[PDB]
């Protein structure tokens, strides 16, 4: 006989709209963080976790929809933030550029026509080489030919903050606490939580910054280790500390581009010109690669491993591309990953102001100067690597060569968010009994 | 809200207490008032669906003649074609998750039978 | 779905089982079909309206004490000034539609009397009975 | 929402009517039928969703107390005079009923669950 | 014993949307007036109102959120209505003016934005002196140095209609239906209404037009008489009729300035040129003075009462800002507020087209001209006055002085919304008894 | 939305028009 039971502890897989949560920092410095929609609820103090005894669940990081949701949420926020900011199309006029290490910074003069009086106003600004394209040595800004360039708004910070994702009511998040989970498969010691740990939405292309660490060992995860087209996510158990700076003592200039809007550029640089170099401890870096190679030897045929440099000619793939303060650094990492494992480090960088962020082509973002001497530091917590594989040669190599890889920027989140799965609760069902 | 891996007997024992927490409100007290353009429309959609789920469960239980109750004995006999297992093993070897999966393909049928047999009660 | 060309008496003989199909239709099935500002906001508004209408009817059955009932009898007498017809004309010659139209003008009076008596005067009587 | 007797409707006379309970969950339907531009439209829709949500929360609480089918519900909970008291004639002949809110919101705020959990 | 009841008539302060209302007037071609966009069904004839016996409530009008809601409704509606209209920035170019009532009207020549087809064309338009700023006779529009000036759409009416506010389900509006209420505290004849009376959203600085009239006699309703930094909102008995004219016969030109962008301006004045003016006649407002006399004891003890002049120096505050048609008048109120008491007249008016509405610096509205010969009349129903603050004297003055003052548009509506308070209904509660 | 100079190619059913481009990128 059928008996109906309501309040039954059963869940099924589901995908839903997720909620944010954040610390109520309330800085109130008249600078809003772009993450202004992150405060839909304060971070729950004393969050709980309940272990479910004898529950086995299948987790799949490669198909994880929370990763896909995070991507949509970050893009949406960026577009909303930049939407109302000043267009820089009045600056697509022909530039007359001369030098100010040689040729890295150029002094460009131009005729701007949007001055209120509707008569030409001569103006000048300093620009970094990466934003200037040749077109007799005349120049134009690199993205004017294809898209609208907008200036990021003053008083909006884009500093990453920890953000916790929370289940909507009626849903729950299951967390995988198994050790050496690795991927695509059963996990024991599954617990239920309301909110995830905080994840800092830090964007980079090669070396993952300010993430979580593996608890016991370096862990290497991949959807498929024989499919040479897949990205291998490597999580470290110790952070490698990286420092970086852009020492030029920049002084900012402001151009009256439109009645209600100002355009900001570097006006002049005081003192000497130096490269925006980064500093990695040699010992920690070398030991980290040693450990990665060891774990790769266990995963792959136990043969010699080598790490090689970036491939391709695309700056967003070949260089690190991290956001430090208000600047975009494009650091040369070929200094790293130049060794074979068979058993300070200075990285030069460039500064670029016009960014094809998220590889969209409708618009580009412009980064204003931040008055010189910018210093930051961060934790290297993991790497995005690919194996080169190769053509079907007749056993011509006993060494597996790996290289830094980048693009997509989804693994930046997947590497931490993979422990979480979303399910829905459907507390209604029936069972046999002795009845009417 | 644990004991998910426990047997059906163990989990349904004192189902009511567990159920009161699950059913304290979908959102408990409007997300315990803690939470009191596109972001807005997505949240309205989420809130509306939560309301519909609540009402659908209450409506279906009401149709079946189960109201103000969590556990109801109905007029529909168990058909062994849905499942033919010892009463004891489903209750003390199987968990609720395993059970719901085991008879997932009979959900529409059982529910339809319950509506017809429970509606035909003179009223 | 129904007939309604039938008389009140005939139509209502199956109310026990015709009801609980109309009720079901309000919440179930359509909402599975729909799992997919032109056709955006409008669908959200449609969902909200359906919920509001549903709750109104349930609230009135509740206020009148017909909780979970399809057919319920209460203590309010019929006022013969309304549809001053024999019982048979009302139940066997007229259809439900015709009937609702004839007494549409007394709906407010009927509903107010039902609220005053059922679950109102009746519950003050119950509070008194439970004092002991 | 006539609220006749909202102040000093004895207290007991207020209870012979209780007719304003049919407004918060119903008049909104009438307002929408009369109506039958996102600048006003989203806010108005949010108001409709909230009105429904508030209605349901009260119904859920009455359900937990075992009062969902009643307009007047006597529960098996003694009144606690350490929170507030006066004679019953004053309570039933002179309505305000706000003096009770700080204390009751915690006393019955908790008891609704304790009562049902330990009811039998 | 605890008994719970669910139809308990109690309430608490709350805020919400107030829907909208209109009288369902036919749109009459043109466009629906912007106020007619409030597509809410007119409050049913004979709106419901219920008097609540024994009800005491505190109607503190100075904290009434309906004022803020009306404020937001007007700002928002105006921006949505002006948003898609023609931008006039191509007209910020230098003009050559020939000065043709003391040079108030100028004839100004355009050198650049003169033709839609490519041509070095010359073009002319007439302007009022108040909108023209000197830069030989070289002039530009007054707000171009900082703002974006848009033309209001020539087809759109912003003319006020009465608007009623209504409560959402779960809410009620409490009406202070009493006599001589002073703006705060009890008024123990409170009724509940489904909606408010209609209020026209008229904005007019110093003299409030088309409001409700005082019942019985004049009331003062200040927030605090001993606080010098406060507005006194006076509601007048009966009413005063004012007749405003701009006695000039115009013509219209339409200049194609940019593709699809037409500038609507004044062509020529037919017949003689005459100064705009408003007529008030032999108004004896001595009963206002007597209400002051009642409150005179608080306002520096019993003193002579004077209203000798409007000051502060800013025409937006100093002059009466009046909307007659599609055009705005600035009238000198010095001829009314000149006399002192012991205890036809005309206001010359200026005409202005570029309006810095609500001091939203960075934006401005251009009012295209009317066809010609505009005459209108309106009712003076109240005044916004301030008292000179007390000076650092030896308490020797025998006279107090009041002046027309204002500019904060919210005080225009505090005068009508003072009777209403919004509360939400909380039907669930308990009381002690003796039962099960 | 600029001036066209049209020369054609029933006769002038299809107009062959010389067009001055409002410049899209370089403002030249
Ligand atoms: C990139 O930049 C960073 C700076 O931003 C720079 O960081 C330095 O890195 C080195 C190498 O890792 C660190 O050196 C180690 O320090 C260990 C001790 O750390 C503690 O004590 C420090 C001493 O100062 C305290 O005590 C004195 C005396 O009483 C007092 O005056 C001081 O005021 C202070 O109280 C202290 O500074 C340090 O605190 C920093 O670090 C913590 C943790 O990150 C942080 O929370 C703090 O806010 C602060 O930044 C901490 O309290 C020491 O044990 C260790 O010794 C090893 O070697 C010896 C042999 O020589 C072995 O015997 C031993 O077992 C260890 O193996 C070593 O000396 C240094 O402290 C960092 N400096 C700072 C300011 O953080 C990176 O190097 C830069 N990288 C590159 C590539 O350039
Ligand atoms: C601003 O402009 C307005 C015009 O827009 C102007 O208004 C006039 O103001 C004067 C002074 O206050 C008013 O004069 C008073 O009129 C009283 C009589 O009113 C009645 O009769 C009027 C005339 O009747 C003739 O026409 C009608 C036409 O239909 C015909 O049947 C009759 O047989 C007769 O031939 C009539 O117009 C008026 O109508 C009202 O209703 C219409 C509705 O549409 C409205 O449009 C009107 O404006 C008006 O409200 C009504 O039927 C008269 O009793 C009064 O005299 C006594 O009081 C004075 C007080 O000072 C004492 O001194 C005197 O001894 C008496 O005791 C006085 O004569 C005049 O009616 C106004 N309207 C018009 C059109 O002229 C403002 O003054 C201007 N203000 C400024 C500052 O410039
Ligand atoms: C890189 O990784 C290291 C190691 O996890 C991070 O160090 C940690 O920094 C936090 C914040 O300063 C320390 O927490 C504080 O500890 C003190 C007690 O000493 C307590 O009083 C404070 O309230 C707070 O809890 C934490 O102890 C420290 N961890 C260790 C092992 O020392 C470092 O911050 C990371 N770098 C970046 C850029 O994220
Ligand atoms: C307050 O409301 C009551 C009705 O609810 C008004 O009527 C009197 O109420 C008192 C107290 O219950 C009775 O003793 C009288 O007999 C009632 N009057 C009549 C004619 O029956 C009361 O007047 C109202 N008070 C105020 C100040 O408004
Ligand atoms: C100015 O006030 C007058 C008088 O109150 C308004 O005119 C009349 O108002 C009474 C109500 O007091 C109505 O019964 C009449 O039908 C109204 N007559 C007309 C012709 O409107 C008048 O509308 C107010 N406003 C203006 C601009 O004059
Ligand atoms: C259930 O839990 C026990 C105790 O940890 C363990 O020995 C057993 O293997 C588990 N069984 C399953 C199916 O997970
Ligand atoms: C560019 O600038 C140099 C001076 O740095 C000047 O001599 C040259 O004529 C300029 N060229 C143009 C095209 O303006
Ligand atoms: C003109 O072109 C020649 C050849 O490429 C180059 O050397 C010279 O510097 C150019 N002129 C300028 C002003 O750059
Ligand atoms: C399961 O996760 C909890 C998290 O608090 C941890 O304390 C416990 O040791 C874990 N158990 C196993 C077997 O991993
Ligand atoms: C990381 O793993 C290696 C290899 O197992 C181990 O030697 C090292 O101590 C671990 N690091 C930390 C910080 O535990
Ligand atoms: C850039 O060149 C211009 C001349 O065209 C000069 O006036 C200006 O000072 C130079 N900028 C800097 C920062 O030296
Ligand atoms: C790093 O510098 C070397 C210098 O020899 C250069 O060959 C290499 O291409 C640079 N890499 C990147 C990513 O710029
Ligand atoms: C990287 O590849 C080049 C290919 O020419 C090879 O010569 C070099 O030795 C490789 N380096 C490492 C570390 O494998
Ligand atoms: C301004 O207009 C007068 C008209 O008499 C003309 O003589 C004068 O040359 C004009 N000035 C300019 C700068 O166009
Ligand atoms: C301004 O004056 C000139 C003559 O100097 C005349 O041709 C032109 O039409 C006038 N413009 C306007 C707008 O009246
Ligand atoms: C220009 O105008 C000024 C008055 O503002 C006058 O004094 C001066 O003589 C005029 N100059 C010419 C050339 O007309
Ligand atoms: C209360 O308001 C009503 C409706 O306007 C009025 O008839 C009644 O006289 C007022 N009562 C008092 C005491 O003012
Ligand atoms: C108004 O009175 C002040 C003194 O309080 C005096 O300075 C001013 O000149 C007077 N203005 C007029 C128009 O009488
Ligand atoms: C259109 O006219 C241009 C000259 O303006 C000519 O070069 C072109 O070939 C013509 N197009 C066609 C299809 O004939």
């Amino acid at each position: 006989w059928v008996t109906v039971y309501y309040g039954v502890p059963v869940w099924k897989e589901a995908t839903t709209t997720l909620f944010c949560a954040s610390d109520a920092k309330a800085y109130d410095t008249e600078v809003r963080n772009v993450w202004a929609t992150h405060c839909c609820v304060p971070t729950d103090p004393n969050p709980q976790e309940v272990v479910l005894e004898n529950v086995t669940e299948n987790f799949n990081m490669w198909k994880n929809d929370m990763v896909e949701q995070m991507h949509e949420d970050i893009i949406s926020l960026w577009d909303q933030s930049l939407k109302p900011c000043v267009k820089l199309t009045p600056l697509c006029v022909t530039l007359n550029c001369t030098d100010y290490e040689r040729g890295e910074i150029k002094n460009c003069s131009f005729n701007i026509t949007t001055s209120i009086r509707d008569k030409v106003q001569k103006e000048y600004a300093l620009f970094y080489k990466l934003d200037i394209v040749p077109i007799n040595n005349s120049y134009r800004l690199i993205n004017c030919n294809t898209s609208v360039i907008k200036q990021a708004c003053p008083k909006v910070s884009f500093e990453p903050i920890p953000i916790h994702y929370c289940a909507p009511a009626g849903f729950a998040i299951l967390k995988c606490n198994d050790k050496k989970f690795n991927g695509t498969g059963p996990c024991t010691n599954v617990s239920t939580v309301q909110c995830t740990h905080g994840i800092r939405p830090v964007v980079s292309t090669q070396l993952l910054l300010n993430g979580s660490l593996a608890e016991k060992e370096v862990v290497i995860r991949s959807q498929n280790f024989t499919n040479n087209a897949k990205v291998i996510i490597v999580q470290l158990n110790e952070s490698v500390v990286i420092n970086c700076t852009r020492p030029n003592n920049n002084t900012r200039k402001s151009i009256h581009i439109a009645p209600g809007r100002w355009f900001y550029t570097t006006g002049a640089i005081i003192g000497d010109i130096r490269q925006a170099h980064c500093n990695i401890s040699r010992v920690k870096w070398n030991n980290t690669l040693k450990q990665i190679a060891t774990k790769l030897r266990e995963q792959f045929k136990n043969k010699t491993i080598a790490f090689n440099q970036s491939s391709g000619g695309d700056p967003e793939i070949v260089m690190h591309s991290f956001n430090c303060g208000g600047e975009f650094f494009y650091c040369n990492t070929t200094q790293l990953f130049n060794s074979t494992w068979n058993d300070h480090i200075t990285l030069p960088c460039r500064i670029k102001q016009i960014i094809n962020m998220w590889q969209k082509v409708g618009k580009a973002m412009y980064a204003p100067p931040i008055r010189g001497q910018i210093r930051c530091s961060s934790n290297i917590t993991g790497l995005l690597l690919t194996r080169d594989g190769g053509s079907n040669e007749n056993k011509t190599s006993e060494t597996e060569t790996f290289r830094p890889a980048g693009g997509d920027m989804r693994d930046n989140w997947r590497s931490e968010l993979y422990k979480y799965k979303v399910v829905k609760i459907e507390p209604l069902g029936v069972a046999p009994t002795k009845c009417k | 809200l644990g004991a998910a891996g426990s047997t059906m007997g163990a989990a349904s024992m004192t189902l009511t207490v567990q159920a009161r927490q699950l059913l304290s409100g979908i959102v408990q007290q409007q997300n315990n008032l803690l939470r009191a353009t596109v972001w807005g429309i997505k949240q309205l959609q989420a809130r509306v669906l939560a309301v519909e789920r609540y009402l659908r469960d209450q409506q279906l239980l009401g149709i079946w003649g189960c109201s103000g109750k969590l556990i109801c004995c109905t007029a529909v006999p168990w058909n062994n074609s849905w499942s033919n297992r010892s009463l004891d093993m489903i209750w003390n070897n199987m968990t609720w998750i395993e059970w719901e999966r085991e008879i997932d393909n009979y959900t529409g049928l059982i529910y339809n039978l319950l509506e017809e047999s429970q509606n035909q009660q003179e009223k």
Side-chain angles (χ1 to χ4, degrees), chain A, chain B:
Chain A
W1 289 87
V2 178
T3 297
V4 178
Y5 299 85
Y6 185 62
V8 175
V10 175
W11 60 87
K12 295 189 180 184
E13 294 184 354
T15 180
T16 191
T17 301
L18 303 176
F19 282 99
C20 75
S22 63
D23 291 354
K25 296 297 188 189
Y27 288 118
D28 298 344
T29 60
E30 300 182 344
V31 178
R32 70 183 183 88
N33 196 298
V34 71
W35 294 103
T37 60
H38 66 314
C39 64
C40 62
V41 68
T43 303
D44 286 346
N46 191 23
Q48 303 300 305
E49 179 176 353
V50 178
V51 176
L52 308 177
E53 296 84 357
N54 285 112
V55 176
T56 301
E57 283 282 339
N58 295 315
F59 288 79
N60 186 312
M61 70 188 286
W62 307 110
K63 296 183 179 180
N64 189 293
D65 63 315
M66 296 181 78
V67 174
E68 295 299 310
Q69 186 65 50
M70 187 180 282
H71 182 73
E72 183 178 359
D73 289 346
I74 200 165
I75 298 299
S76 180
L77 181 61
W78 272 108
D79 288 350
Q80 291 174 349
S81 183
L82 296 173
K83 180 177 179 179
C85 303
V86 68
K87 293 182 180 179
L88 300 182
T89 59
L91 300 171
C92 293
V93 299
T94 302
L95 303 176
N96 186 50
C97 303
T98 189
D99 201 346
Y100 182 81
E101 296 178 5
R102 185 179 296 278
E104 189 66 21
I105 300 169
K106 296 188 179 185
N107 186 30
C108 299
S109 62
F110 58 93
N111 296 318
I112 185 165
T113 61
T114 61
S115 176
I116 292 167
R117 67 185 185 186
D118 202 21
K119 300 287 182 177
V120 173
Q121 175 67 57
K122 186 176 181 180
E123 293 291 350
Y124 71 92
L126 301 180
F127 298 94
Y128 293 98
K129 182 176 178 181
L130 292 173
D131 292 312
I132 304 298
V133 60
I135 185 166
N136 63 75
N137 58 325
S138 65
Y139 298 89
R140 64 181 180 185
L141 298 174
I142 188 65
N143 289 291
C144 285
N145 193 52
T146 62
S147 69
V148 176
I149 302 166
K150 293 184 177 179
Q151 180 172 255
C153 289
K155 307 296 184 183
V156 181
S157 172
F158 295 87
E159 183 182 4
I161 62 172
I163 299 171
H164 300 255
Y165 279 101
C166 301
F171 295 84
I173 300 167
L174 302 180
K175 180 169 72 174
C176 179
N177 289 314
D178 201 347
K179 302 296 184 178
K180 303 183 184 183
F181 166 69
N182 296 342
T184 61
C187 178
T188 192
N189 206 57
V190 176
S191 65
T192 300
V193 300
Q194 183 63 41
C195 301
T196 67
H197 64 75
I199 298 170
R200 295 176 182 272
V202 178
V203 179
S204 68
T205 60
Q206 293 176 4
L207 305 175
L208 298 173
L209 301 174
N210 291 359
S212 67
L213 299 175
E215 292 178 356
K216 300 295 185 181
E217 64 179 2
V218 175
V219 177
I220 302 174
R221 302 191 288 272
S222 179
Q223 188 170 16
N224 187 322
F225 287 102
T226 62
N227 185 328
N228 297 337
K230 300 294 186 177
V231 175
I232 299 168
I233 298 172
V234 180
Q235 183 178 25
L236 305 178
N237 58 336
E238 184 178 0
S239 296
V240 177
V241 176
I242 181 167
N243 298 316
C244 202
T245 185
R246 189 276 307 280
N248 292 345
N249 196 3
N250 294 339
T251 172
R252 194 166 70 189
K253 181 174 174 66
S254 179
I255 297 169
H256 199 188
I257 194 166
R261 296 290 186 276
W262 293 86
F263 172 61
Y264 297 90
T265 67
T266 301
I269 304 172
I270 298 168
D272 289 341
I273 304 302
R274 295 289 184 271
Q275 293 184 324
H277 65 295
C278 299
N279 282 60
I280 297 169
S281 174
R282 187 178 298 109
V283 173
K284 293 291 184 180
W285 181 252
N286 190 61
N287 288 342
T288 297
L289 291 174
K290 182 178 177 181
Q291 291 177 44
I292 294 167
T294 298
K295 294 299 293 182
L296 289 168
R297 287 194 297 273
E298 291 177 349
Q299 181 61 59
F300 292 90
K301 182 175 179 179
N302 188 16
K303 67 184 186 182
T304 302
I305 294 175
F307 295 100
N308 213 313
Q309 70 173 50
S310 298
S311 64
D314 183 335
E316 297 295 342
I317 304 301
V318 301
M319 292 178 285
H320 195 183
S321 299
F322 61 90
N323 186 344
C324 177
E327 295 287 2
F328 293 85
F329 284 65
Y330 290 79
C331 297
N332 187 339
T333 58
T334 67
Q335 189 64 52
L336 306 175
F337 311 106
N338 192 34
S339 65
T340 300
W341 298 95
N342 185 11
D343 188 353
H344 299 299
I345 299 167
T346 300
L347 309 181
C349 311
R350 297 181 182 278
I351 304 298
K352 187 175 188 179
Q353 295 177 275
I354 302 169
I355 309 301
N356 289 324
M357 190 182 66
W358 304 113
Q359 292 77 49
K360 302 296 186 183
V361 299
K363 63 185 185 293
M365 181 178 74
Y366 173 80
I370 56 171
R371 301 189 67 194
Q373 289 283 300
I374 177 68
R375 179 72 166 179
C376 63
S377 66
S378 66
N379 283 7
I380 299 168
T381 59
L383 297 90
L384 304 178
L385 303 174
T386 57
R387 66 183 290 198
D388 286 349
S391 66
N392 191 19
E393 295 186 355
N394 55 320
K395 299 182 181 179
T396 59
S397 177
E398 297 181 357
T399 300
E400 186 67 34
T401 299
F402 296 83
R403 293 177 187 265
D408 293 346
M409 293 178 280
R410 303 300 186 87
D411 293 316
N412 287 343
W413 300 325
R414 184 174 289 110
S415 68
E416 295 181 0
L417 187 56
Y418 76 95
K419 292 184 180 183
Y420 298 99
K421 180 179 186 182
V422 177
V423 301
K424 62 184 177 183
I425 309 304
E426 293 187 340
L428 178 65
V430 300
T433 191
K434 296 188 187 293
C435 263
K436 293 178 179 179
Chain B
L1 298 176
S6 299
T7 63
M8 290 169 66
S12 294
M13 186 70 67
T14 320
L15 184 63
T16 302
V17 173
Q18 293 169 70
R20 289 185 189 101
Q21 181 179 359
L22 290 170
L23 304 176
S24 71
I26 296 300
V27 296
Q28 298 84 50
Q29 302 296 296
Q30 294 179 270
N31 298 303
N32 298 325
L33 302 175
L34 187 60
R35 294 183 187 273
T37 302
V38 74
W39 305 118
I41 198 66
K42 288 181 174 181
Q43 290 303 322
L44 288 171
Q45 185 66 55
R47 291 170 73 199
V48 171
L49 292 171
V51 171
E52 290 178 0
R53 289 193 299 274
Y54 176 77
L55 293 173
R56 185 171 66 195
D57 287 346
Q58 292 298 310
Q59 184 181 88
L60 181 57
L61 290 168
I63 292 167
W64 291 342
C66 187
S67 178
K69 295 183 180 180
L70 299 175
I71 302 174
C72 296
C73 179
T74 75
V76 176
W78 187 261
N79 193 327
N80 288 339
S81 72
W82 301 340
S83 177
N84 189 26
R85 292 181 180 275
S86 297
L87 181 62
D88 53 271
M89 74 176 282
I90 68 171
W91 280 99
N92 325 293
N93 292 109
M94 296 180 74
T95 68
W96 273 109
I97 294 167
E98 290 166 344
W99 177 250
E100 187 64 24
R101 290 174 181 171
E102 182 69 9
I103 59 167
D104 188 74
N105 61 312
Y106 300 101
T107 299
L109 176 59
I110 293 167
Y111 290 3
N112 289 339
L113 291 170
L114 289 170
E115 291 186 345
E116 291 182 354
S117 293
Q118 298 298 106
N119 290 339
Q120 294 176 35
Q121 298 291 321
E122 295 175 355
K123 297 184 189 296

